[PDB]
């Protein structure tokens, strides 16, 4: 019980900071730098935190930055690829063998 | 109202204009066809009416518009 | 000639305007137009209009060598393979 | 048509009565039907149009139940959609 | 297509998926990008009603 | 003491609230939004608010200066509203209408039968469609027609007009389709209609101008809008058009418009009903 | 109310359709009012097939003026008077009796 | 580095021993007066505080601009991504050689002050028409023409592999080449054996995308090509069924017939213009001649032209032994009597016959092919 009760005013106290944006990488670069590109401005390069590896940056990724020095913070989950757009787009009715007459 | 001269290349109408510019003491506005030609839609009334305004605003001001068939096509 | 063929209304005669601007600014400098048969033939517009946002570059082209002080110590020459299809009012002397 | 571009060329001809008939097995199965309908009959009343028409006959013969208000259909729908269809394709 | 596990991917030339292929695809060919990254793939173009 | 510490924390809802919209929730108590200013944020959810309302595209109240979720928000919207039918009835009847009866009871069977009696289409299963389509010669009876339907039904009525979506600030087209979707989903079995669709649904884009972006992101969001309904929903879309050869093919599969209607020139027979109705 | 049908364009994405809204509010609310376009041609020629962007928008104003005059909600005590010295040129829809 | 190119004596004299002990011996008396100041008179690190301090001064926030115009003193304009354009300056350790207009140049956050430039993001229309690997084998599949090969090679190969011979007697290398004939002759196998073959850029382009839906895109597009293709390297650039450009037209077209004559003024320019060509290769393809411009093909811009004629009976014999290499024909077939089934057979149909009877032959799971598949084949084939 003491445990939830000083969790929740501290909880109280640490939600006033700023929030983080969302942005997508292009590619990476040498010595912990990456390149990205948040839609409502240009492109920026950044550097990585500590605890994230380059290898694990695939480019065409959605990642996380933070406020004051853009630094790269997490990887969000994904986007969705140009093919499933398209595709959904188009509405082709798929089908199988067994709707053959003939 | 107005006149408009007319006839083959090479004869002296431009320089009766510059003429008429030089002799005449009022203001004088000098106006090609395709400079009135613009990119974006709407903006190419806009600086008829300019023109004709600061022409009003300044009361003798005459202007002279040069290969009119660019335009009244 | 086939660089000043552009994909929007009015930009020519803009891209004339520039250079002779460019040219002006220096001393006394040479222009050199190649393949003028692309850029101008002749005014012909019957039935749809057709072919005339190039009549306007060329009227524009026309318009910057003679009347309210000719471009003044720019030289220029042309060249082309077919002249028979030059339009009347660029050929008279003064410009040419 | 240079013989070195296409490698297989593949026809397919207007249903005649059995693969008409196929069809219409193969349609007719997302409605609540009625035991016996004689479904030869309907196949051989259609002159070998399409095989986009005899789904479109099978999707409309249900109206046909749902404007008397039923929960099943009868053969009566199945002759009176052919009719209507058949007929109503020779304007344009 | 479906029967064989093949990316079915069909073109008709229109304008709104120009943005899904490349900023201004100025040829075709640029398709292939997107399609060799699902190898085992199939184009499918259908003749409008024109011809 | 726990009972007076958890009341303590609502200090951060009094004045500083900006509307936005929620978009996806990567975990607990932490999520990504999208603010009416123009940008996205990846924020910290407030706790004691219940996560049972976060729905896909719920609308939230976010802090002004840390940015972060604090209320869930009731449905809200904008544009029309509702054809409060106050001054809204068009008192157009059916009796005055003659001759094209064949239309009628196309549009009948397509629109208000399955509003009422959708037991019977379940029971046959004829998939009943999603929406219509009217076209033909300028004159002869569109939008009467779409006027005796809203003065004749018992369902809720928004009528729009298809160059209204693009506005000065970028952005409002998407926001202002999905919230008129929303209210017509979450208010009641409504009818949603729409005038001359060849202002937005096009063939030809140019890449390039900026409004022709616009544009294609309107009729984008259009799509992936009217595509997201479960065949469960009571909602039926009326759109009319007069030149129909200039339209987007891929506006026409099925699920987004399954009945075409033709409103042609009277030949012999209408005629003389028009005039003794009209006489 | 007087307007020339060539001076209510302007090169931003919404405001030349939202002028001839703001024109017919205004109408509506002092009921007693006449509406006189000069040169109708200007904004009210047919609609292109295959047509240009930038040209579009124009066609949108159009088609919106079709549904302001004669459209979902009736008008009352509102007149309108157009001229034009080539009325070949006008919408098939415009031209409706 | 071509630091020394004097190894003339490439042999065990005494000459390369010296030459190589007094390059030697220069670079490590310099090594030792580069390092004396190194080891003597240090005074700092100048190793890794140097780039410590010009990472200090450089922000970890960095965005990014484009040049637009330059002044002398060591400033410039570049605009952001918004639209703003600015006046900043330029840092002394950009290296300041690269700076072109139009090049992405990296910014700082506070005062916007020029402090990098960027590379370029490759391009997403040269890997479309550039060729990665070799298609397939070389002359030796060809066979039958054995005298347009030479004047190919005249045209192509010499030049690279031996620049000797032009020289002793002064002379230049023919400058283009053209290949026309009636379809199905050989034209497109020869430019997959002349890409195969050569180590130069192999660079393609069919005529019939050279025409756009928009007004000056196809000058455009012949333009960035011939800047591509003089940018990378000695090369060579293949354009094949280019008279398709003038025999059809369609309705997608904006502008007329009009935009193919400036296509065309554009062409011509760039093949025969004023400017430095440098070293560029062009091959033309094409099955109706008589279409084509006269002035396109014009002596100094296209300076040979190959026909490939029918093949004669020896040639199909010889074709027939080519495609059934890798084929268990059985003793009943015989190839005389394939000869004389058309009076104008090509060489395509030779492939689709033997292509279609080894499909029928796997039809019915049979290894060997028959008489009766061959039979079949060539009235499935031809006769339609
Ligand atoms: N029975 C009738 N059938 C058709 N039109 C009628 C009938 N009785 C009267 N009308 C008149 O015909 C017109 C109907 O046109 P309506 O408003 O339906 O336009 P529309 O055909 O949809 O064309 P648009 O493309 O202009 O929207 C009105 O002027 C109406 O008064
Ligand atoms: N002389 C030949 N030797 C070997 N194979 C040949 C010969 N001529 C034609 N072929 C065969 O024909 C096939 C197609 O030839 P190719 O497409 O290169 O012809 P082309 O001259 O470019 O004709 P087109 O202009 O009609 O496209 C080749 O892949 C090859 O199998
Ligand atoms: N007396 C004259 N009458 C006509 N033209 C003259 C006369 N004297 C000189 N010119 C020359 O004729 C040209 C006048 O330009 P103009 O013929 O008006 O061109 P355009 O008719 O194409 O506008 C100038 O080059 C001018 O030097
Ligand atoms: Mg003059
Ligand atoms: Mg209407
Ligand atoms: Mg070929």
Do not use: W
């Not at chain 1, 630094?71 to 595709?87: A, Q």
């Not at chain 8, 309705?251 to 320019?269: A, H, K, P, V, W």
């Amino acid at each position: 019980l003491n445990a939830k009760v000083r969790l929740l005013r501290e909880e109280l106290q640490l939600l006033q900071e700023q929030g983080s944006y969302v942005g997508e990488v292009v590619r990476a670069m040498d010595k912990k730098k990456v390149l990205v590109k948040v839609h409502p401005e240009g492109k920026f390069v950044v550097d990585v935190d500590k605890n994230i590896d380059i290898n694990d940056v695939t480019p065409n990724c959605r990642v996380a930055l933070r406020n004051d020095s853009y630094t790269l913070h997490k990887i969000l989950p994904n986007k969705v690829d140009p093919l499933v757009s398209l595709m959904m787009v188009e509405k082709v009715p798929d089908s199988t063998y067994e709707m053959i007459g003939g | 109202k107005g006149v408009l001269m007319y006839g083959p290349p090479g004869t002296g109408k431009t320089l009766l204009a510059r003429a008429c510019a030089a002799q005449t003491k009022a203001t004088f506005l000098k106006l090609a066809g395709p400079q009135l030609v613009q990119m974006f839609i709407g903006d190419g009334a806009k600086l008829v009416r300019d023109a004709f305004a600061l022409a009003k605003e300044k009361a003798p001001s005459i202007i002279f518009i040069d290969e009119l068939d660019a335009i009244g096509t | 000639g086939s660089e000043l063929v552009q994909k929007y209304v009015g930009e020519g005669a803009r891209m004339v305007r520039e250079l002779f601007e460019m040219a002006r600014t220096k001393k006394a400098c040479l222009i050199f137009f190649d393949e003028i048969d692309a850029i101008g033939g002749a005014r012909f517009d019957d039935g749809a209009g057709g072919d005339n946002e190039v009549q306007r570059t060329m009227l524009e082209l026309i318009n910057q060598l003679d009347g309210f002080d000719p471009r003044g110590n720019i030289k220029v020459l042309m060249a082309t393979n077919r002249p028979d299809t030059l339009d009347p009012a660029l050929m008279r002397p003064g410009r040419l | 048509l240079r013989p070195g571009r296409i490698d297989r060329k593949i026809e397919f001809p207007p249903p005649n009565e059995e693969a008409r008939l196929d069809i219409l097995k193969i349609h007719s199965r997302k409605m609540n039907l009625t035991r016996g309908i004689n479904l030869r009959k309907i196949a051989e009343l259609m002159p070998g149009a399409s095989g986009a028409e005899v789904k479109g006959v099978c999707t409309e013969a249900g109206m046909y139940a749902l404007r008397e208000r039923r929960v099943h259909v009868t053969q009566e729908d199945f002759e009176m959609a052919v009719a209507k269809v058949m007929q109503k394709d020779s304007e344009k | 297509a479906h029967h064989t596990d093949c990316t079915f991917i069909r073109v008709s030339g229109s304008e709104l998926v120009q943005k899904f292929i490349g900023e201004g695809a100025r040829m075709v060919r640029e398709l292939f990008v997107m399609a060799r990254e699902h190898a085992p793939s199939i184009i499918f173009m259908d003749e409008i009603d024109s011809i | 003491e726990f009972l007076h510490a958890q009341e303590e924390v609502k200090r951060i809802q009094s004045i500083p609230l900006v509307i936005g919209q929620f978009l996806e929730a990567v975990d607990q108590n932490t999520a990504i939004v999208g603010s009416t200013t123009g940008s996205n944020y990846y924020v910290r959810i407030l706790s004691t608010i219940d996560r049972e309302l976060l729905k896909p595209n719920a609308s939230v109240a976010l802090h002004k200066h840390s940015n972060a979720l604090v209320d869930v928000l009731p449905p809200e919207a904008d544009s029309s509203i509702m054809m409060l039918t106050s001054d809204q009835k068009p008192d157009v009847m059916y009796a005055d209408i003659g001759g094209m009866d064949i239309q009628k009871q196309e549009v009948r069977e397509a629109v208000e039968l399955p509003l009422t009696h959708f037991e019977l289409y379940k029971q046959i299963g004829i998939d009943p469609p999603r929406g219509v389509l009217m076209y033909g010669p300028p004159g002869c009876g569109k939008t009467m027609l779409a006027k005796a339907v809203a003065h004749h039904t018992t369902a809720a009525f928004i009528r729009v007009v298809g160059s209204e979506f693009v506005q000065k600030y970028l952005g409002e087209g998407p926001r202002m389709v999905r919230d008129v979707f929303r209210l017509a989903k979450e208010n009641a079995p409504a009818i949603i209609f729409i005038d001359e669709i060849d202002a937005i649904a096009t063939k030809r884009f140019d890449a390039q101008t900026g409004a022709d972006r616009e544009v294609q992101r309107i009729l984008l969001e259009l799509l992936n809008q009217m595509d997201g309904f479960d065949q469960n929903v009571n909602v039926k879309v009326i759109m009319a058009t007069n030149r129909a050869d200039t339209l987007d093919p891929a506006l026409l599969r099925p699920g987004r418009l399954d009945r075409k209607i033709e409103f042609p020139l009277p030949d012999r027979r209408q005629k003389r009903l028009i005039f003794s109705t009209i006489t | 109310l007087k307007v020339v049908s060539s001076s209510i364009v302007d090169k931003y994405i919404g405001e030349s359709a939202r002028l001839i809204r703001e024109m017919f509010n205004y109408a509506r609310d002092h009921q007693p009012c006449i509406i006189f376009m000069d040169e109708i041609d200007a904004i009210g020629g047919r609609r292109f097939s295959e047509g240009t962007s930038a040209d579009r928008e124009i066609q949108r104003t159009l088609m919106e003026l079709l549904n302001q005059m004669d459209g979902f909600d009736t008008l009352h005590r509102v007149k309108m008077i157009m001229a034009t010295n080539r009325p070949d040129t006008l919408d098939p829809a415009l031209l409706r009796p | 580095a071509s630091k020394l190119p004097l190894v003339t004596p490439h042999t065990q004299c005494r000459l390369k021993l010296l030459k190589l002990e007094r390059i030697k011996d220069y670079l490590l008396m310099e090594e030792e007066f580069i390092r004396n100041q190194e080891q003597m008179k240090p005074l700092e690190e100048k190793q890794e505080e140097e780039r410590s301090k010009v990472d200090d001064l450089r922000g970890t926030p960095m965005s990014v601009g484009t040049l637009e115009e330059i002044i002398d003193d060591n400033h410039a304009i570049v605009s952001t991504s918004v639209g703003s354009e600015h006046y900043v300056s330029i840092l002394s350790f950009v290296d300041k050689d690269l700076l072109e207009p139009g090049c992405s140049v990296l910014l700082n956050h506070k005062v916007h002050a020029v402090i990098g430039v960027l590379m370029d993001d490759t391009d997403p229309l040269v890997t479309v028409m550039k060729v990665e690997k070799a298609p397939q084998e070389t002359y030796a599949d060809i066979g039958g023409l054995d005298n347009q090969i030479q004047e190919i090679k005249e045209s192509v190969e010499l030049p690279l592999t031996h620049p000797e011979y032009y020289e002793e007697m002064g002379i230049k290398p023919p400058k283009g080449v053209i290949l026309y004939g009636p379809p199905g002759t050989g034209k497109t196998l020869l430019a997959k054996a002349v890409a195969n073959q050569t180590s130069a850029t192999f660079l393609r382009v069919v005529g019939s995308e050279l025409i756009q839906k928009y007004l000056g895109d196809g000058p455009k597009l012949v333009r960035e090509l011939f800047r591509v293709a003089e940018e990378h390297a000695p090369s060579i650039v293949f354009i094949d069924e280019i008279d398709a450009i003038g025999t059809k037209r369609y309705d997608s077209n904006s502008g007329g017939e009009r935009e193919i004559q400036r296509t065309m003024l554009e062409l011509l320019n760039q093949l025969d213009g004023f400017d430095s060509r440098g070293d560029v290769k062009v091959i033309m393809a094409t099955n109706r001649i008589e279409t084509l411009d006269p002035a396109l093909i014009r002596p100094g811009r296209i300076d040979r032209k190959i026909e490939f004629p029918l093949p004669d009976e020896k040639t199909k014999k010889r074709i027939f032994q080519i495609h059934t290499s890798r084929m268990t024909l059985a003793d009943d077939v015989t190839l005389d009597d394939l000869i004389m089934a058309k009076d104008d057979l090509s060489g395509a149909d030779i492939k689709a016959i033997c292509t279609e009877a080894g499909l029928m032959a796997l039809r019915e799971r049979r290894m060997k092919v028959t008489n009766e598949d061959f039979k079949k084949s060539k009235e499935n084939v031809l006769y339609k």
